[PDB]
Design a protein around this ligand. Structure first.
Ligand code: AMP
Ligand code: AMP
Ligand code: AMP
Ligand code: AMP
Ligand code: AMP
Ligand code: AMP
Ligand code: MG
Ligand code: MG
Ligand code: MG
Lengths: 191, 191, 191
């Protein structure tokens, strides 16, 4: 039976970066994890239906459309969990124009049944200055108070996940200049 | 099917004023929502049983009585949602002497099945100053820190609602003098 | 119908002390509550299976094994409530190296079905300083920001418990030198 790890964090905080660095560090110690980006799973579905051109248009779609593709992505990822350990790079909540949407509503949560939910955080300062540094995404320059609001709600959603499934909720700080301490923390967790 | 929108906010933050101003501007365009204050539905029952004289006495009743009448109101409101779109002006949590009571415990939540949960917020400074200026109600002069504690727990309960049903959780600021921008935001969320 | 009250709080905040003092002043009024420490119940099962020698080793055990023992301890505490009122001295979340673990995952929460969930809080300064004078544990000297992080997540979990069951969620300040005032408050809450 395989370990299913969810890594979450607002855009710019480094959930994806922490995850790639962690899996390569685990493979050097002999530990096999698969990286899966939840948003890519969805975007293959959405791109195939013609609803979007790029992945940062997904959060602006009608939220019933997002929840339909949200569920197909979660089913395809649950299939992956049978065949290897998996780390899911995704989001505790997604900021849509109609409010925060839970990234793992109970029906999605119950099919992944994640063993651990990791929250990657740093100060909204660093997140904002990091967003201003990367035209690689159509990332929202919000205020730091909007990022602080998102990290607040993401904690609430994640602790709810832990009440429903029994998963532990691990907060890892990923601060400017200290990416390496965060990789130590996440590696220490996955043993 | 018909849209169910829940609007929430601590007393004094203007949840009711935002709900009435938004609905009337939508009627200028022919877009009909029916306003339903959850507490009025509760107060009609409580007063008919002889439990209270006014609506601000209900949260000081035995919490078992409140949950009894709370459950009746959710069913009565759910029936209304069959006859038109509804915005439910109500509360993420209610402050009772025995603690915060969820405004939508899970059985009520599943009976209303809302699409959107709106959290109306502003500074506890501005809330306190409105309660002191409001001769329609017997509003509690709490410390500003008790108001911030109530807005903290309201966020927590609301994100739990979004985890359990999939409803999106929208935060809207309703600042002094800027009621109209808050009305503009909600109208936009409801299109 | 018998009362089930849950009192929760980070280590060092005085949840245990507040429960014992409240029960003695209540018996002077003829009000019988039974104290139950969830961890003591867990440790009885655990030491009988040989997993630990002392109780601070339990939160570092296999979270598959902890939830098996948390599951049985919640079931043993439910039986106690059939025979008397009970105050359960436990924790909203337990801080493990694998993250925060909900103390009442939904299946444990529903077996206890508490009426009131008390959160004991004070400033992270006072908790930290209390941990330093306490040779009954090797007490966790965390930073004050980690103690604050733990109290933030305990609020999130507790409000989720209130959404799922209907329990009221009561915050009680247990400040240095003012234990007797926190005791008055809890007594007042239980009448
Ligand atoms: N600890 C860190 N310190 C500085 N920059 C970082 C850190 N973690 C991530 N970044 C950068 O921040 C941006 C956000 O990356 P991510 O959210 O991982 O896609 C990328 O340009 C990263 O290289
Ligand atoms: N669990 C999820 N639920 C809903 N939408 C998601 C989820 N994970 C990712 N997304 C969407 O995928 C996009 C790309 O994710 P990311 O690459 O991880 O920033 C996000 O902006 C969201 O629109
Ligand atoms: N944006 C605002 N600026 C000033 N006063 C407001 C605002 N929103 C509501 N009020 C007032 O604040 C009080 C709270 O109203 P409500 O909660 O809607 O009953 C009432 O006196 C309102 O008229
Ligand atoms: N969802 C709810 N659940 C329980 N009580 C509620 C709810 N909504 C309103 N109430 C009660 O109704 C009273 C008046 O509500 P309001 O006029 O919305 O300030 C509140 O002070 C509460 O006692
Ligand atoms: N609800 C709970 N779920 C899991 N472990 C718990 C729970 N309550 C207590 N424990 C364990 O018991 C230990 C001692 O509890 P306490 O004496 O109340 O601080 C804790 O540090 C946990 O390892
Ligand atoms: N209000 C208070 N003021 C000072 N010390 C307290 C207070 N409440 C509890 N304590 C002490 O704080 C320590 C931790 O409490 P506990 O979590 O019950 O183990 C114990 O030594 C208690 O005696
Ligand atoms: Mg990413
Ligand atoms: Mg109102
Ligand atoms: Mg204790």
């Amino acid at each position: 039976k395989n370990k299913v790890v969810v890594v979450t964090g607002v855009p710019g905080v480094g959930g994806t970066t922490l995850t790639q660095k962690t899996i390569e560090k685990l493979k050097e110690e002999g530990i096999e994890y698969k990286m899966v980006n939840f948003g890519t799973v969805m975007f293959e579905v959405a791109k195939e239906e013609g609803l979007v051109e790029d992945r940062d248009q997904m959060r602006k779609l009608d939220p019933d459309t997002q929840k339909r593709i949200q569920k197909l992505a979660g089913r395809k990822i649950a299939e992956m969990a049978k065949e290897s350990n998996v780390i899911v790079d995704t989001h505790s909540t997604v900021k849509t124009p109609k409010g925060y949407l839970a990234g793992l509503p109970i029906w999605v949560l119950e099919e992944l049944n994640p063993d651990i939910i990791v929250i990657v955080e740093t100060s909204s300062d660093e997140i904002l200055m990091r967003r201003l540094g990367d035209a690689t995404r159509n990332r929202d320059i919000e205020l730091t108070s909007d990022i602080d609001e998102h990290q607040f709600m993401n904690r609430c959603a994640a602790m709810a996940y832990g009440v429903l499934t029994g998963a532990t909720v691990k907060i890892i700080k990923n601060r400017d200049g200290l990416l390496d301490k965060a990789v130590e923390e996440l590696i220490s967790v996955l043993k």
